[model samples]
Target chain A: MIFVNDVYKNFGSLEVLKGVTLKVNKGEVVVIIGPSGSGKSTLLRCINLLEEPTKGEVFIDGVKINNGKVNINKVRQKVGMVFQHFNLFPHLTAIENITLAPVKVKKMNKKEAEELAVDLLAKVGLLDKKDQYPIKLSGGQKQRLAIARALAMQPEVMLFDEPTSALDPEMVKEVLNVMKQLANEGMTMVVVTHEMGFAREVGDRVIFMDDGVIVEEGTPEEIFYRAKNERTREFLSKIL
Target chain B: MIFVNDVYKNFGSLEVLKGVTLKVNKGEVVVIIGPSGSGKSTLLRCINLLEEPTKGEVFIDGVKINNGKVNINKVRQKVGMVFQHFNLFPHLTAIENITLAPVKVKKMNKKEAEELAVDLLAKVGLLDKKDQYPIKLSGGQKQRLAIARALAMQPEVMLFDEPTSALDPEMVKEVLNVMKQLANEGMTMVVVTHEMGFAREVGDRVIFMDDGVIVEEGTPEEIFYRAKNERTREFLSKIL
Candidate 1:
């Protein structure tokens, strides 16, 4: 499970997230939906401590993270993230990207890392493109490579910040399919996506946000079909 | 005009080019297409003296280059290149990437270099991404930024080696469109690309290369329509 208590993030004069709080349970698919500049990405990033909250406490599986005393690398290894832009290492091949953190961070041997990478690439249906560079892949393929790269860390929870936002319309489904499969396998996932269909079909719970604040949180059916907030209804209407 | 006479290159026992000779008239768009390890990249690189040919002479605009007396940096300045992977300095923003070469290599002042960078970025349709880091842009955007960085030098001849090969499928066209526009504006260019359509449409001549040799060269129509050598035919079949 994850716990984010009263997080605040600022960029000089621009306060990105203001007093935000949320929690995610194990083996649950939590979908976050919001308009642009709602600090959804900042929220997702806080989980893995990619961005340290100025004033907040984040707990991953009951372990406090981002504290000066804790080992940040160990927490990072335990919590994985797939970026929207599919930040596949341009200098690395697909398989190499997957195996790098494991071999370097975890100090896993080459043989062990390679084996895991091969299996993960196969799981993402990109085994044939293993040796290919990130440049040679489509958006979907690159995103899938990112997934495999994150999965190689063997993280307890996955954070997806607008996973398919940067993908082409046709390529989005390919990436979503991999996410759907991961969700079906009971992986704990916190996904920030605008894909209402994904929230309805795959998300266990839906958290809606507006202006850096969580406006509503409920089961997908409750949130999507019977949302109590007028703003939430208006937000859904524009997308739907 | 450009003349390459009996070019020979080797990497230990692996001979990359063997007595290869070619010519490109002023204002010609010549596209070289081949598979991986065909030395297409090496051939392009040699034009700017990035890679030295073991035995050969290269003449640019009737001036003898690669004669051991010619200034390599001067020649390189005249022949700009955009790499496949877009090797922009990670620490610098888009504008800084363009300004560095102008300010450092060309000895332009800070004000002059900034003006040049701004102009080049605008020319490449990336004026807004000026202050953004290279990591912030998409692959297509990064490649375009690289192009702008090269254009800041205002080279007489532009060499693009697999420019769009590192881009997403959808993103390829965005980068290619810029190249096409450049070609339309009568910039002398030699491009190495797998996009057969771009080769056929924008290139004045299509050169089929394989095993480090120019197997066949002809007009785009002739290369695309007519059946020439078995090697050219085979290379085309696999690619197209």
Candidate 2:
């Protein structure tokens, strides 16, 4: 579970996220959608503790992650983050990329790490590519590899920041299929995407943000079919 | 099995390939070595019919490709070409990149084409990357994909022009491994490269070129170890 209360972030002179309060239950799928340059990505970043909120309280599984003497790294391992770009190490082969963090950070046994790497590769439908480098894989394959890399940590929450934005039209489906599968298996997720279809089908709750504040938050049907906010209706109108 | 007789290509006043003549038996590995701007690549382009020769006769399996009333496309398929740059379709996945030509040019059945793609991917050790895009692949992987794309036509011979020139030091070995494996399998190949070790190990005969002309031609031992030409000695001294 994730909890945030009155989150406000500032980059010196500019406010990126303003008084954003949200709660996510265990195994909940929350989708954030808005126009480009909106603070949707910023909010996701804050939740993952990638960026420190200027003012807010944040918690992951009831453990306070902000402004405390907590081991930030330890708390971070429980929240896996996926970026728009894969951010995989180019030189490392697929399996090595997955095992590097586990072995180094977790002090995992090399043999067991490798075995776990193989299992994750198979789960993402990339068992055969375990020996191939990331550059040999497709965009979708890289994204799935990224997903697998995060899953290797066994985090309680997964945070995706526009995971499919860089892919071509046909390639987008492959990445979304993996995301949908994760959602179906009841992975707690916070995804920021323009994929309306994915938002409708997989998102339990959809949040609409504009100008550093969420204008509306509700079920998928409420956001897509019957948004109470005119700004929400306007944004949906442009994309839909 | 392959012949280039008195071929001269003048891209305007630049006589890129000046009267180059070469021949290879059915299962010969002919390695071409030269400095940059020495027309090594241009000569390979002429042989593959990718560049029109200003004056020359080109043949594959004894069929003239230059001025014959023959189907150039049909004869071209008999010789597969790999370039310094991969030239893979960005929008297409690995399997689709390999299958496109066979289905469009060869009129192959979609099912059979897909099967051929899978087989070729496996042969190049990229069966796991069948669904991957070119951008996600490493330099060596892209070159391997280019090789697989070429092999899908079932060409009798393969031509590589500086195949590893663009790869990083680590990546060069991966691509050459596939090339060496192919050579060992008795595939007739014409390679233009600077990897001295690969030439020594893989080349049955070595041909040296400079200033758009053949500097020397001899067995690998004769050229690398006992070169009779001053230019061959000079070139080898610089690279070695």
Candidate 3:
């Protein structure tokens, strides 16, 4: 469902991402783990064009985003991205936030959009908070709302960049549980995260990157317990 | 007027706050500062009953909240609070987030709530973003939306817990500028923050806490330039 080919990203004189290539299959949960400055986040951002790759080709469901021929906005509607921060609308209630893009972009009618939002909110276990503003929510609730918002778009693929890193320790589980649910439901997802446990349990495959290059890629047990690369072993030791 | 008399709080076997007392008059801006684990956040939470005080008397406008006799929900309506995270609803647009509370709690009509929300969004300089979801806002804009949501309650006082701390350095000023405008407009506010510049310029009084006790209380100049207590001076030196 997604593919990145020979991606390279440079910031002025700094090479943030060296040549990188990867593929994600439908209903697959691929977790990317790496140290700071390893270009994990930059790689994810490029997938959604939140940061246009300095050089590379990114394809979603066979649509080439790097060619500049694709309708970026339309493509984005089909590829949802969640950030470290929940990135919820401060001015809208949970229901309203979920419905905005559908009503405005998809031209979904108000009533239909609202119903869909309510259903998504319930799926995320936030039906009770549908009418509440974000300020009234806990860190866990807000992240759930973010998930619901992305799901409301009904994207074919989802990308998460350190989704639970900003949350309190206790709150992290709630957001991860929701993500785990999505993976179980056959959603195609690519995640950049530091949570080794989530990577081991929920991820179908784990990719380890260092110095902007793909250091290793394997099943959870292979990466967590028996990484062949010395760099991967050293990084995992410090964090795990 | 608000009065917190001899407040104490505990979690399990751990005492989080020792006896603490404070007062704030109408239209006053009080800035609270302390190291992590000093119970500054707990104190703020206690003010709104987000956290129940183990032992204390909290009076807002002559009604005793700590006694459990006053209607806590009604008191919360009159005391708005913003947090380090913007906590805006991910599912709603800017305008919808603001109007929700008034329409539900105040029994305000949709048209009236929307007009008020638009005006308030303008006050926060986000009128153009009335239809934008929280996901579309910058960190500064989201915090401003939080302020507007709080204002929509038509509260007698506003409580801010590290309102600008989550923002990027460049984004911090936009949120602080909005806060400064609110202070200038005579909104009684109690803020727990680390921004020394904001404390000096916008705070009518600054309270320094150490080990859950108020170490010193004075004007910003007195607290910043001439803190008499050794702990206060030490804390300021490290941060400043």
What is the C-alpha lDDT profile of model 2 across B91-177, one tens digit per residue?
999999999999999899999999999998999999889998999998889999999999999999999988987664446777998
| Number of residue pairs clashing in candidate 3, backbone atoms closer than 3 angstroms, sequence gap of 3 or more or interchain | 13
Tens digit of lDDT per residue, candidate 1, span A1-240?
799999999988888888899888888999988766778889999998888898989998888886788988888888898898887799999999999998998899999999999999999999999999999998888999999999999988999988987764446677888999999999999999977888888999998877888888899999888999988887776555
Score residue B94 of candidate 2 by CA lDDT. Answer: 93
Worst lDDT 10-window in candidate 3 chain B: B165-174
Q: Which regions of candidate 1 are displaced past 4 Å? A: A1-240
Q: Candidate 1: DockQ?
A: 0.02
Determine the TM-score of chain B of model 2: 0.96
- Please give the RMSD of candidate 3 to the true structure: 17.5
iRMSD in angstroms, per model: 11.4, 20.6, 11.8
- Which candidate would rank higher by TM-score, 2 or 3? 3
DockQ of each: 0.02, 0.01, 0.02
TM-score of chain A of each: 0.97, 0.97, 0.98
Q: How does each model score on TM-score?
A: 0.53, 0.52, 0.54
